[PDB]
């Protein structure tokens, strides 16, 4: 269609077949037919017309690729020229990570609606994946403050790594 099914999965659709157990006519069936004739059909033709115009003028746009530069770990201290590139990279990855957590949150919300009253059991995978990604995001970026930077992120990581070393030292 338009989006990738892998990034935004949707289980296969299973609609039951009509099994009328009444002699009465179904009002929804005739309303659906009227909707197709009076709404879907004229709307579809107007779109097919517009698509005929867009095919006569076909042009492209691209997704910007960003080459990787050295991280703030490789920057000599107070070396602004290398700090600037690492800092800009870190900010780009920060925004992307925000959108990753949004994708995982959108999967979780779609599952909860889709599964209805069975969501508590049928959305356990999406809950787990959301829990893991939120934990990773919290470790990277939480508590940095409004004036966050790659330097502050590194200091937060080093503090976390030091505690992990000490806890293992206990073992």
């Amino acid at each position: 269609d338009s989006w990738d099914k892998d990034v935004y999965p949707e289980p296969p659709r299973r609609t039951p077949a009509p099994s009328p157990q009444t002699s009465l006519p179904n009002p929804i069936t005739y309303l659906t037919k009227a909707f197709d004739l009076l709404v879907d059909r004229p709307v579809t033709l107007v779109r097919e017309f517009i698509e005929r115009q867009h095919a006569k003028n076909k042009y492209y746009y691209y997704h910007r690729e960003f080459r990787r530069v050295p991280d703030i770990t490789e920057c000599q201290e107070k070396d602004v020229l290398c700090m600037f590139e690492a800092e800009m990279q870190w900010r780009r990855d920060y925004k992307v990570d925000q959108e990753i957590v949004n994708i995982i949150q959108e999967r979780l919300k779609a599952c909860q609606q889709r599964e209805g009253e069975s969501h508590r059991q049928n959305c356990a995978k999406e809950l787990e994946q959301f829990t893991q990604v939120v934990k990773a995001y919290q470790d990277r970026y939480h508590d940095l403050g409004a004036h966050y930077s790659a330097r502050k992120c590194l200091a937060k990581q080093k503090q976390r790594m030091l505690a992990e070393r000490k806890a293992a030292k206990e073992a």
């Binding site: 929804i28 309303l31 925000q98 949004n102 949150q105 919300k109 599952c111 609606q113 809950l127």
Partner: protein
């Protein structure tokens, strides 16, 4: 999906078109009120199609069409939840609003600003539909405060009247206090669940939900006018009667109960919240029904009935029956809007007389208004198989078979008896006996706008409860086994209320004067809550504002300790420096002192 999603949005888009036309000068203001009424009738028709699809197969969906704003990891989209609660409330609200609007064409005919009145009524409705279909909390807040502001504008319709402006600002004040809880719930959900979306809130299912749910209860306490924040609803009677009918059946007062229903996945697991809402509902339903027993303004009697019915809904929330509470919202809308339109019919015919003591003898003079009033009264009291019976009766027998606070259950049962008493008061004093109104008779209920609008709500007050109950899917286990005395409790206490009410009413006709009792004054003056609170709290706050905040601090002490002290010192120092005799002898004598201390004390020469 294409028809369901498409039709459920035209309903909302259809209602905004009169607003767009008015705001964009593209309308024929000949009969704008008829235009607005027609659009509402067509919205009701288009709203039935999605509802029928839900009735058929339980089809529900969420529409997140427009991405509005992303705050880091909180994406906010314009979303609409088309579920069980949305698909049944919307057609009911539109159907009731269809009658109120046709009724208001007759009732507000003489108003020079009737066009603006119908625009405000339509905005009132649009903000309620935003509230009821909101899928995230921010969208809900937009409609939550939208109905609050439209309520302010309509209650204070007659803005030359000081009482209408006091009542309007009172509604904002009490609802803003409730809104503290709404903001609290939003902040907790954002902090602890990283979401304002209803789906993520339920998926994560917080276990320690005391704080968010207390905030939600506080918001519902204000909007639904429960005990503590209750006085504003009776005061809202300052508005034109069409406002009261719409503000009490649909829109405002029901939003508080609806908010707790929307969050039943959380409340259904938190016992401590259930106890609080149960007791909050029980005191409200008992206290307000007690107040209605002695009111003489017909609108205030009906207003206190709404407060007592909303209290009953909160009790239903308190016993973990959100779906019964929702059913009561839907059934209540019919006969309560009808009752207000019946009182408006009487008030109009008696030259804006509202005291029941100056009515009487209208049973035969206003036959159609009489019929609707009796049907509305019987439905309110749970008469078997009228619309009210299909919610109220199930609520009472679900409350005496639950594991529940015994005082709350007993207080709720007494309130049911009181419901039959004040209902009998309106019929006895407005319809029966001899006329007590002025001598120039002008009664006339023969306008088709009046008749048709009430007739539709009369058909609703008879069959709507039966239709809805037989079409909604089951979502609980109805508890149908119980002792006979628990099954028929509601029916019996109602009958006892009618009998006791009739004896009390008939004793007003005896030639005996009795000094008022203490309990009579307590009921008449609303437990003195408005008399005390609305004088004491404004006085303390307003006196502090002037005496301390403004006078003591801003105009005195903050001036004294900085600018006034600093500048005074500079003036004193200036006079010391410049007050000299201009005498050569003194200046040069000071030179010698300076040179000496420069050497003796400071060693500037070393």
């Amino acid at each position: 999906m294409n028809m369901f999603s498409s039709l459920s949005l035209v309903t909302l888009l259809l209602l905004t078109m009169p607003i767009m036309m008015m705001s964009f000068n593209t309308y024929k203001p000949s009969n704008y009120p008829l235009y607005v009424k027609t659009a509402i009738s067509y919205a009701f028709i288009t709203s039935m199609i999605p509802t029928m699809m839900f009735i058929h197969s339980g089809q529900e969906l969420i529409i997140s069409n427009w991405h509005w704003l992303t705050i880091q990891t909180l994406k906010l989209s314009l979303s609409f939840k088309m579920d069980y609660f949305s698909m049944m409330f919307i057609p009911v609200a539109l159907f009731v609003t269809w009658s109120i609007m046709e009724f208001s064409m007759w009732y507000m005919y003489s108003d020079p600003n009737i066009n603006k009145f119908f625009k405000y009524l339509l905005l009132f409705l649009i903000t309620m539909l935003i509230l009821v279909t909101a899928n995230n909390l921010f969208q809900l807040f937009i409609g939550w405060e939208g109905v609050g502001i439209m309520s302010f504008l309509l209650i204070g319709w007659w803005y030359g009247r000081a009482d209408a402006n006091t009542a309007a600002l009172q509604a904002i004040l009490y609802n803003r206090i409730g809104d503290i809880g709404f903001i609290l719930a939003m902040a907790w959900f954002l902090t602890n669940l990283n979401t304002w979306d209803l789906q993520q809130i339920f998926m994560l299912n917080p276990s320690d939900s005391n704080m968010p749910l207390i905030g939600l209860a506080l918001a519902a306490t204000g909007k639904s006018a429960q005990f503590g924040l209750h006085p504003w609803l009776p005061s809202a009677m300052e508005g034109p009667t069409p406002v009261s009918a719409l503000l009490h059946s649909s829109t405002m007062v029901v939003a508080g109960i609806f908010l707790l229903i929307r969050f039943y996945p959380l409340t259904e697991n938190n016992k401590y919240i259930q106890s609080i809402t149960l007791c909050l509902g029980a005191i409200t339903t008992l206290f307000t029904a007690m107040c209605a027993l002695t009111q003489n303004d017909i609108k205030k009697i009906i207003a206190f009935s709404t407060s007592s019915q909303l209290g009953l809904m909160m009790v239903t929330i308190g016993i973990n029956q959100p779906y019964l509470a929702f059913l009561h919202i839907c059934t209540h809308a019919f006969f309560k809007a009808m009752l207000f339109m019946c009182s408006g019919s009487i008030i109009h015919s008696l030259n804006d007389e509202q005291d029941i003591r100056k009515m009487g003898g209208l049973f035969k003079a206003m036959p159609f208004t009489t019929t609707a009033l009796i049907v509305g009264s019987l439905a309110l009291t749970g008469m078997p198989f009228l619309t009210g019976f299909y919610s109220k009766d199930l609520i009472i027998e679900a409350a005496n078979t639950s594991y529940t606070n015994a005082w709350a259950l007993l207080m709720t049962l007494i309130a049911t008896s009181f419901t039959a008493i004040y209902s009998t008061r309106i019929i006895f004093f407005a319809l029966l006996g001899q006329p007590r109104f002025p001598t120039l008779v002008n009664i006339n209920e023969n306008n088709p706008l009046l008749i048709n609008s009430i007739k539709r709500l009369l058909i609703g007050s008879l069959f709507a409860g039966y239709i809805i109950s037989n079409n909604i899917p089951p979502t609980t286990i109805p508890q149908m086994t119980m002792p006979y005395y628990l099954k028929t409790t509601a029916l019996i206490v109602t009958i006892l209320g009618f009998i006791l009410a009739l004896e009390i009413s008939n004793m007003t006709k005896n030639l005996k004067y009795h000094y008022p009792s203490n309990a009579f004054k307590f009921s008449t003056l609303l437990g003195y809550f408005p008399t005390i609170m609305h004088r004491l709290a404004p006085y303390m706050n307003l006196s502090m504002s002037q005496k301390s905040a403004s006078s003591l601090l801003d105009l005195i002490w903050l001036e004294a300790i900085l600018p006034k002290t600093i500048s005074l010192a500079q003036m004193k120092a200036s006079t010391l420096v410049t007050n000299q005799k201009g005498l050569i002898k003194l200046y040069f004598l000071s030179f010698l002192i300076t040179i000496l201390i420069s050497m003796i004390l400071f060693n500037f020469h070393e």
